[PDB]
Structures are given as structure tokens and as C-alpha cells.
Design a binder for this molecule. Structure first.
Ligand code: NA
Length: 110
């Protein structure tokens, strides 16, 4: 079983992965494939990649000991995006919209 807090976190993940947010969430569904995206320096710049599929695997694997660890990975995902891309990239705007969802939902955890 997941703790109470982590059951709430699981719901946030479900929401982030849901159709309602897909127009901006889709770049975060799978790990960045540096070769396929021709971003060949990606792993020189980003030392700790993260994406929502990995968060889902970790959740299912009961790897998070608390809600704070879940939040850390999700914030890492957005931060990687802000760090790597120019601030006017369309993907940064998509990250921001999805982060607005995440931060609001996380803060509203009972
Ligand atoms: Na609350």
C-alpha cells in the first residue's frame, strides 16, 4: 500500500498523464531520447534526467518514502527542462503550464 500522502500523489500523477493536460504534458511522458531528438549534448548538461514514466515506475515500485521525494522528482523534471532549453522555447511554456497543475495539486494535499 501507498501511504495516505502517496495515494494523493498517485492522483496528481494520474491527472498529469490525463487527456485534460495532454496538449502540454506530452513532452514529459517519456525519457528524453537525446539521440532521437538530436540533442546530443543533453546528458552533458542534465545529470539526472526525469520524466513522468519514470515517476510512474518509481511510484509502482514503492520507491518514494514520502510525498517530498515524489515532489522532488517532478520538480527535477521541470527544472531539467528549464535548465537545458532557451527560455523562449515552446517546450518551456508547456513545462510551465504543467508545473502550474503540479504545484497547485501538491499544495492542496490534505
Ligand atoms: Na489543503
Amino acid at each position: 500500500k501507498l501511504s495516505e500522502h502517496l495515494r494523493y500523489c498517485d492522483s496528481i500523477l494520474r491527472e498529469m498523464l490525463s487527456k485534460k493536460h495532454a496538449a502540454y504534458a506530452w513532452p514529459f511522458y517519456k525519457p528524453v531520447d537525446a539521440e532521437a531528438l538530436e540533442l546530443h549534448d543533453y546528458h552533458d548538461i542534465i545529470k539526472h534526467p526525469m520524466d513522468l514514466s519514470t515517476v510512474k515506475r518509481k511510484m509502482d515500485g514503492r520507491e518514494y518514502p514520502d510525498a517530498q521525494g515524489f515532489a522532488a522528482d517532478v520538480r527535477l523534471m521541470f527544472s531539467n527542462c528549464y535548465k537545458y532549453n532557451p527560455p523562449d522555447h515552446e517546450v518551456v511554456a508547456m513545462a510551465r503550464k504543467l508545473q502550474d497543475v503540479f504545484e497547485m495539486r501538491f499544495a492542496k494535499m490534505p
